[PDB]
Amino acid sequence: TQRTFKLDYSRDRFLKDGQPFRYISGSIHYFRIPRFYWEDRLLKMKMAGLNAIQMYVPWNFHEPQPGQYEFSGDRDVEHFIQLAHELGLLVILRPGPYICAEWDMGGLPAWLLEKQSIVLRSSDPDYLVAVDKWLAVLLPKMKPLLYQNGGPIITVQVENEYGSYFACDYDYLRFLVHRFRYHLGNDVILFTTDGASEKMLKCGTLQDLYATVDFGTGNNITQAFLVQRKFEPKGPLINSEFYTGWLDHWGKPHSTVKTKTLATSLYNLLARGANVNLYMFIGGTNFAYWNGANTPYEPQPTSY
Amino acid sequence: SAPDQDEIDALPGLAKQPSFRQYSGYLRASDSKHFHYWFVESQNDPKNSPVVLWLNGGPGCSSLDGLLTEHGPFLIQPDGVTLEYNPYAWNLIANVLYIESPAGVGFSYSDDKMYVTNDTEVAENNYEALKDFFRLFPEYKDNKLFLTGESYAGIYIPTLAVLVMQDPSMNLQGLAVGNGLASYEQNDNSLVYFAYYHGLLGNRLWTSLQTHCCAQNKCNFYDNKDPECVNNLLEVSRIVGKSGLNIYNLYAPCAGGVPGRHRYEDTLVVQDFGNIFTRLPLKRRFPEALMRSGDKVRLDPPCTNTTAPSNYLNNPYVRKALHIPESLPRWDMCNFLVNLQYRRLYQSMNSQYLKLLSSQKYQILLYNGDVDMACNFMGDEWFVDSLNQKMEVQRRPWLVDYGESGEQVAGFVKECSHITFLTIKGAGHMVPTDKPRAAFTMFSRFLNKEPY
Amino acid sequence: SAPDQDEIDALPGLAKQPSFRQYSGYLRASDSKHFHYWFVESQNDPKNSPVVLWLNGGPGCSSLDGLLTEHGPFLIQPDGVTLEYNPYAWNLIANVLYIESPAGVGFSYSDDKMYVTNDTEVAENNYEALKDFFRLFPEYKDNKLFLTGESYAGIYIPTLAVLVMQDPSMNLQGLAVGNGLASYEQNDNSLVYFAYYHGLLGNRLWTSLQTHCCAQNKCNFYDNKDPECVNNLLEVSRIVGKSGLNIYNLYAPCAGGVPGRHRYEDTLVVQDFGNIFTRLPLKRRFPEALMRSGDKVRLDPPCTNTTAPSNYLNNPYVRKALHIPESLPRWDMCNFLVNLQYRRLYQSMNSQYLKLLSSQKYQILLYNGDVDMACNFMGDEWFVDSLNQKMEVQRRPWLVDYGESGEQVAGFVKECSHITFLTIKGAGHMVPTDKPRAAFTMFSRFLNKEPY
Numbered sequence A: 001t002q003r004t005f006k007l008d009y010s011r012d013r014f015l016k017d018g019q020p021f022r023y024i025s026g027s028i029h030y031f032r033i034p035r036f037y038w039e040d041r042l043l044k045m046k047m048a049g050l051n052a053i054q055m056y057v058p059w060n061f062h063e064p065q066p067g068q069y070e071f072s073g074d075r076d077v078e079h080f081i082q083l084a085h086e087l088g089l090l091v092i093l094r095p096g097p098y099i100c101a102e103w104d105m106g107g108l109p110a111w112l113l114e115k116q117s118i119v120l121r122s123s124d125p126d127y128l129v130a131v132d133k134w135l136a137v138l139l140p141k142m143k144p145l146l147y148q149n150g151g152p153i154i155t156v157q158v159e160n161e162y163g164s165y166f167a168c169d170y171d172y173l174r175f176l177v178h179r180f181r182y183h184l185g186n187d188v189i190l191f192t193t194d195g196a197s198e199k200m201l202k203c204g205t206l207q208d209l210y211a212t213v214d215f216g217t218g219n220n221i222t223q224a225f226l227v228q229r230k231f232e233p234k235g236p237l238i239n240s241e242f243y244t245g246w247l248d249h250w251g252k253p254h255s256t257v258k259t260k261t262l263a264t265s266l267y268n269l270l271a272r273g274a275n276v277n278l279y280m281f282i283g284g285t286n287f288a289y290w291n292g293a294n295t296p297y298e299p300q301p302t303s304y
Numbered sequence B, C: 001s002a003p004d005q006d007e008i009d010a011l012p013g014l015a016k017q018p019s020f021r022q023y024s025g026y027l028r029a030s031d032s033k034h035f036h037y038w039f040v041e042s043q044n045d046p047k048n049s050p051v052v053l054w055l056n057g058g059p060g061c062s063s064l065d066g067l068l069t070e071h072g073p074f075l076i077q078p079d080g081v082t083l084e085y086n087p088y089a090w091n092l093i094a095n096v097l098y099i100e101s102p103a104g105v106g107f108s109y110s111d112d113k114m115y116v117t118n119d120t121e122v123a124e125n126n127y128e129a130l131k132d133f134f135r136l137f138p139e140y141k142d143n144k145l146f147l148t149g150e151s152y153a154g155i156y157i158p159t160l161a162v163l164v165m166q167d168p169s170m171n172l173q174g175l176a177v178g179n180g181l182a183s184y185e186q187n188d189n190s191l192v193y194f195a196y197y198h199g200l201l202g203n204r205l206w207t208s209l210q211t212h213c214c215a216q217n218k219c220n221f222y223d224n225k226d227p228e229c230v231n232n233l234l235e236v237s238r239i240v241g242k243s244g245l246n247i248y249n250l251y252a253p254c255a256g257g258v259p260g261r262h263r264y265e266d267t268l269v270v271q272d273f274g275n276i277f278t279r280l281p282l283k284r285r286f287p288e289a290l291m292r293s294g295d296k297v298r299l300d301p302p303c304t305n306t307t308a309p310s311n312y313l314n315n316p317y318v319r320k321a322l323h324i325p326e327s328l329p330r331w332d333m334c335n336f337l338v339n340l341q342y343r344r345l346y347q348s349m350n351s352q353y354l355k356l357l358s359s360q361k362y363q364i365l366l367y368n369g370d371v372d373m374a375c376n377f378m379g380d381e382w383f384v385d386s387l388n389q390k391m392e393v394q395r396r397p398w399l400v401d402y403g404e405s406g407e408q409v410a411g412f413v414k415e416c417s418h419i420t421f422l423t424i425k426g427a428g429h430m431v432p433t434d435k436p437r438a439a440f441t442m443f444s445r446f447l448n449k450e451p452y
């Protein structure tokens, strides 16, 4: 009756309690929706037939000021995970520390910028120290929620399109991976997500860490999973963010993608037996200053 | 601490970057000479993992062979472009430091470009390189240190070990030598026996050998002067070298074939390390080879295809990443010129092993692949028996378990206090290439001093 | 002509039916006994292709092993359901007749069900079966006939050959024996040497053996009575049998493992053919095994997984297709009871080989896998050297070419007029399983009498 979840390299899949498994997940951000309504969306997610969720932990949402942490009520992410477990949903946790996500500063707290020349998402000693401290705070809360400890957490993302960042630091990724293994244990399943082109995986992937890609309906699916397999010859095919829609910008016309086109693409992905997460399943809300920005500057609106 | 200018940003041909830190640079040999090093940190808790030094043999061959092709953290696939992680790599439980020694081998060099050297100079250069290493990576001085190598490193390692024994700053915990040449006499004799009992000589040759080279139960295959005896030994060497057998693995195929055409281009491949039958009058086929300008010569092991490793190390992006001065010429696993100009000085390893055994503080293990003829297991078991040490465990076989496939025999082990002999069933000169997993299990139990 | 009732309509588990004709039936052994045969016609011009008889050894093992697992027209995949054509099958250039002999082995039987027999009875039954075969398939009487076999068939074949030599109707053209037991004395001696030179004995054991079992250059490992000598030999046999080594292939894995648990169910697996160390006082572990009713016992080779072949031959649709009476019980590669009740009569093959050499009309070749310990190559080379024949070619190695991979060494060959010794480098007891292609090239040049 012991819960043995691990990747099955032989049969290109997951194994859950000895049984073949692949997940069909949707993204839900507990923070872009008020806690009053969490259950609601999650139940709808269950009613849609998803068996897992893929969610981000925004560092800035819990530590607005250095050493000040908020984790209760609307701030109680752990309660959100527990609620998902109570609904019979599994959880894919994506704790960053950078999440992108059209969210402010990719989740990183603005007070990091108190060092003017500090570098984010690099081997900057002060950045690495702050990241480490955040992990040492957040991850022990997630530990009892791990699948092997009886909770809903089955896999953990370490980055987000790291291949798009200029640094191409593999020491940084190694440092993150060592700290994640240290705080969470060797049992955890760790994965990455990057744009579906080998150029990004070049700087995103890492030994001792599973590699996945993301892509929407405007990508050759065969080519995308071939790209993944070039980095993961064995194991499940995974699209961690199969885009069902797209973000908006103020002034830019609202992006719309036809429903049934997404449906056809989703069927195609499913027919390969891969693991897919629908980003986003619910978008929720851009509160007071939680929006992000692109370059050339174009802020995302309140509606998500 | 670590030299940032030596750290490896990335290695081309690898799809996913290593999860452990790895450095590549140069260590201070004698002022002009600068050894080429490649350090790879443990894949689990490197800060507290033992430090294992690796040296290849030759003399004149690169220690990057054990890394890129035997037990390094990654291995070159046949395409010579892609690198695949090795589930049986030695770097899974230890911090391995590979050293291309002496100068001129691989990426090692010297200001004066004097590739000629000798046992004493190589030992002094190795000791100075180890001191520099410990001064460049002070954080690993405390880690348990082990000296390992293969083939000709069977001479290098113990002589260097005597030097290591004189430095209290180095935490020497034990030593391990794979298929080492303990004694040219014991090696040549065991080789002749091996050849007869492995169907390489024949009863006619065997009878002649016993008649012209032996006393009653005493055979002299080392410095025998009997004319027909020497002729028989020359025939034996002809058969071992250029009749088509793989001196590194009797039971393995020959890469591209040796008894066919000698060469297909103007590049000559030499496979004589000049360490076998040294006291026998050989034929000077080296002067027969053209000495004209532009005649490129390279030293490669017999029936071994070095193409892949060369094409990797010689790849501009890899050479750049590995901080290798663009000045230095092309890369080869073994340097012909180094071997040709090498000066052998030691005769037997008796004194070295006696020096190491006198302290009785280090755990030493010698392991031999049972299909090798360059340093056959018999010669090393004879040597170790001739050491006349106290027996701690009577010879017996040792087992290894493979994924859902039951227990299997990996070899035999003889244990005397602080020194052990072990065979690896089915492995050749490059034990990690033939029996990766068994090599890893034995290495792990050695390093961890867990009795078998 | 051919017996229509014996023809094979089809064989289950095979996706595409054979392109050559194949029969399966029974040949008249002594009136009560009826041998089980399996004839497979050549895949090219069978009407004019030579007839090669194949016999396995034991004593008490099925000749269907060489077919379904060594050099038959098809091989059983690990699933034990599917059959795949073999690109290296002996039936590519010859008509091979496999005979399960003696009665009781495989699908052979007798009215009286007297499985007990002896060398002379087995030879007479084989001769009567050959006569019946030639009377059932008169069209192949003219085809060149060759007698081949393996292991214990090293006794069977030459004694039977003497009978074959008395029949002018059989077109005996030559004979070939793979890893045959030419002499228990020469085999035990060569085995002890093999064990020492292959790291199986150790210097302590070697010294004791030389002290208690040898004259000066004379060793007696056959009928030595010295007490400690016999104890050392018993230890040797313990190590060879039940320490984890594969007596059929030193360098190969052990199927499921022998030094683990003895058995996992109420089926006991015996791996002693009782042909080795016969003059040595063994321990009666057979009475130790339970004799109670329902204790099923089967004879299988050490570290060999016979499951697949059994599950194929024992499959109702295959048994039906192969015209096998439903009465007969389950199928095993070797019959324990047959071995237990077997009576060995011949001591050495000297007289048989002298009888075959006196005619000087037949081409004979003995080939041995260099990693076997049941009938090691050394014992057979010694035997052949002890035959004192005229040397025609001094011992040398022979080559074989593989697809775009250059020439390779396959072994060594000694040629005396009409009789030759050959080694197969890398092959075990079942040479076709370890070196299929080399086995085929050697077989082809033998049959075609093309000198190497």
Ligand SMILES: *[C@@H]1O[C@H](CO)[C@@H](O[C@@H]2O[C@H](CO)[C@@H](O[C@@H]3O[C@H](CO)[C@@H](O)[C@H](O)[C@@H]3O)[C@H](O)[C@H]2NC(C)=O)[C@H](O)[C@H]1NC(C)=O
Binding pocket: B078, B079, B080, B255, B256, B257, B305, B306, B307, B308
């Ligand atoms: C030693 O290893 C090197 C590794 O690169 C081998 O080189 C590769 O050899 C293969 C087989 O000969 C070549 O494949 C061939 O490609 C041609 C087309 O160019 C095709 O027509 C042939 O049928 C075959 O597929 C491959 O191109 C070649 N690659 C390189 C970079 O050299 C070399 O053959 C090995 N030699 C020995 C003696 O082991």
Ligand SMILES: *[C@@H]1O[C@H](CO)[C@@H](O[C@@H]2O[C@H](CO)[C@@H](O[C@@H]3O[C@H](CO)[C@@H](O)[C@H](O)[C@@H]3O)[C@H](O)[C@H]2NC(C)=O)[C@H](O)[C@H]1NC(C)=O
Binding pocket: C078, C079, C080, C255, C256, C257, C305, C306, C307, C308
């Ligand atoms: C000897 O050969 C026979 C050939 O049939 C082997 O039997 C097969 O063994 C494999 C491996 O143990 C079995 O596969 C297993 O299947 C189960 C599901 O039933 C699965 O959970 C395991 O992970 C594995 O895949 C296979 O079913 C079995 N088939 C038959 C017909 O027996 C046997 O294991 C071999 N034994 C030895 C000692 O070599």
Ligand SMILES: *[C@@H]1O[C@H](CO)[C@@H](O)[C@H](O)[C@H]1NC(C)=O
Binding pocket: A220, A221, A222, A223
């Ligand atoms: C994707 O690319 C592969 C090969 O690059 C091709 O076979 C396939 O038809 C393409 N499919 C789409 C939908 O572009």
Ligand SMILES: *[C@@H]1O[C@H](CO)[C@@H](O)[C@H](O)[C@H]1NC(C)=O
Binding pocket: B117, B118, B120, B121, B345
């Ligand atoms: C090795 O070569 C150096 C070159 O100067 C020489 O000084 C030294 O004496 C040589 N070694 C021996 C043992 O002679």
Ligand SMILES: *[C@@H]1O[C@H](CO)[C@@H](O)[C@H](O)[C@H]1NC(C)=O
Binding pocket: C117, C118, C120, C121, C345
């Ligand atoms: C073999 O057994 C038969 C059984 O009747 C017997 O007649 C025969 O004499 C035996 N062989 C020898 C050589 O005694």
